[PDB]
């Protein structure tokens, strides 16, 4: 198991980025600490 954590080049995690983690596909949106859902490569979507 495990997961990913999305941050900027400077250390500010990104709150509501979409993601797609593939090992089977587990889609979702990162948490307030920019953390994926627990489960691999991750594809991050776009935000407004």
């Amino acid at each position: 198991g495990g997961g990913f954590i999305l941050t900027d080049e400077a250390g500010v995690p990104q709150p509501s980025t979409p993601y797609r983690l593939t090992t089977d596909i587990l889609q979702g949106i990162t948490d307030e600490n920019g953390k994926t859902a627990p489960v691999v490569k991750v594809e991050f979507g776009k935000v407004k």
């Binding site: 198991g1 495990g2 900027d8 596909i25 889609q27 691999v40 776009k46």
Partner: protein
């Protein structure tokens, strides 16, 4: 307004640590691309009509609902066979699909893209009732198939664009239909107006969870309708299935159903089973000379093996038994047929179609076996009379004009279409029809600008009458999967297989007085 994350390292190790690994990614600007999905709801095309649709046409048009007993119906069939299934050609929805500009890989600066989708037509013993009910409810089922096809098209588009540098800022729809794809198209537009959750589900299942801005179910940019016929036939008189309620088809187009809506209408479509759902008064509607498949396409070219040759009963053939001495031209059926012929020769509905073929009254005379009268010395004959129209090699070039009118309307609405080139020789107009097409295009502009189109003159309407097909006729067809009650007209599906009988329908019978039934909104 949109942002993406460029990821240097994007992989990790699973384990019992269950460790969470930072993924530093820089914040990149993201384009907002307006993605338009072209929804193309066809009618019948380069396909034959399935049995269920043809049997649906029995409703209200069987030989029993008319005063045609089974003996007279078989005599009508014999008459037609002695004077002289159908596969159609590519419709205008096919050509609009081929010409709808597709976007596969976006450019570095492209902020608007187009993808396209094609949905086929509705019609293309135990199951037979279920099949006729499937055709009866075909509009909503086709909108559902459109949702699945939208998912597939979005998957293909985002498979051509891997690791996107853009966000889809809007999902637009260009919905095009021909008649039962036109009701379907209208239904689809209403589902987009009602923001149906199935549409948003399909967009999400095609984008695979990717964020898209705008209304979650999208918006309709252009609604292009060719001849809205919600139902071709019915189930009201079918004993097996009439219990089912009408399908929840939404055909009313409120001022926010789309940004631009355009309908072309067949001015010379007169069949009973093909009644118009008109948008006149609410949205721009162009009435154009021609039949149903002369507005939406579907007639094979002159030189094909499937060339359209019209040998049509323009009156219901009428038979009566008389004495063999009696002259065929001194019979009630002949007088009725001649009355119908002289009515049709003055009818303005066929004013421009009849001068391009021969209109005659055709007489059939057979012998009648009656031994009882033979002993009395009376020999007897069955004399039937009908009105026959014969026209050969009807060109299909007026659906290209209707195509160009719809292309002009859509291009005004903002839709991008590939140019019609000399490469497309199926879309090239005869010289006789070139200037007229311009006039037709101008007429479309007039109805789109709210004005009144400059109508075609009678010389121009004659030249167009070379190209319009007579689709309403009294030719009889038969099927062995039904039995129609001779007294009530109720249809009974043969649920255990054909019983060897023949049930007779006039599938393309004209509406009464040769005036099409129009349902306004």
């Amino acid at each position: 307004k949109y942002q993406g994350y460029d990821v240097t390292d994007a992989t990790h190790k699973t384990s019992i640590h269950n460790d969470w690994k930072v993924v530093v990614a820089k914040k990149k600007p993201a384009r907002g691309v307006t993605l338009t999905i072209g929804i193309f709801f066809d009618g019948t095309g380069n396909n034959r009509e399935n049995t269920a649709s043809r049997l649906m046409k029995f409703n209200e048009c069987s030989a029993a609902r008319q005063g045609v007993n089974q003996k007279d119906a078989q005599s009508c069939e014999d008459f037609l066979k002695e004077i002289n299934s159908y596969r159609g050609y590519y419709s205008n929805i096919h050509w609009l699909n081929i010409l709808y500009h597709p976007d596969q890989v976006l450019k570095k600066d492209q902020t608007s893209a187009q993808i396209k989708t094609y949905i086929s037509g509705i019609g293309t013993g135990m199951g037979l009732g279920t099949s006729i009910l499937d055709i009866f409810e075909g509009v909503v089922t086709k909108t559902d198939e459109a949702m699945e096809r939208i998912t597939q098209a979005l998957s293909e588009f985002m498979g051509f664009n891997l690791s996107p540098d853009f966000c889809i800022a809007k999902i637009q729809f260009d919905v095009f239909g021909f008649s039962r794809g036109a009701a379907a198209a209208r239904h689809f537009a209403n589902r987009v107006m009602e923001q149906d959750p199935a549409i948003a589900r399909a967009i999400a299942k095609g984008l695979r969870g990717d964020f898209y801005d705008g209304k979650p179910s999208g918006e309709v940019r252009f609604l292009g309708l060719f001849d809205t016929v919600a139902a071709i036939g019915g189930i009201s008189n079918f004993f097996d299935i009439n219990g089912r309620s009408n399908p929840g088809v939404k055909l009313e187009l409120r001022p926010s159903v789309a940004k631009k809506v355009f309908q072309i209408t067949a001015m010379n479509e007169y069949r009973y089973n093909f009644s118009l759902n008109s948008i006149k008064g609410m949205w721009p509607e162009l009435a154009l000379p021609g039949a149903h498949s002369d507005i939406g396409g579907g007639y094979n070219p002159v030189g094909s093996p499937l060339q359209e040759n019209e040998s049509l009963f323009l009156s219901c053939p009428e038979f009566e038994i008389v004495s063999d001495d009696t002259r065929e031209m001194d019979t009630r059926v002949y007088r009725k047929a001649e009355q119908v012929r002289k009515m049709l020769m003055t009818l303005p509905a066929l004013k421009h179609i009849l001068p391009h073929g021969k209109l005659t009254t055709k007489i059939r005379s057979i012998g009648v076996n009656n031994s009882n009268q033979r002993r009395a010395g009376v020999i007897q004959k069955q004399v039937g009379a009908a009105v026959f129209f014969e026209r050969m090699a009807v060109p299909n070039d007026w659906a290209n004009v209707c195509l160009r009118v719809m292309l002009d309307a859509a291009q005004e609405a903002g839709v991008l279409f590939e140019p019609i080139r000399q490469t497309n020789t199926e879309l090239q107009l005869p010289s006789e029809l070139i200037f007229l097409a311009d006039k037709a295009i101008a007429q479309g502009k007039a109805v789109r600008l709210g004005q009144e189109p400059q109508a075609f003159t009678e010389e121009e309407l004659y030249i167009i009458g070379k190209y319009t097909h007579c689709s309403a006729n009294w030719n009889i067809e038969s099927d062995g999967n039904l039995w129609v009650d001779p007294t009530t007209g109720e249809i009974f599906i043969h649920r255990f297989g054909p019983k060897g009988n023949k049930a007779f329908v006039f599938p393309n019978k004209p509406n009464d007085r040769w005036i099409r039934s129009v349902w306004y909104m």
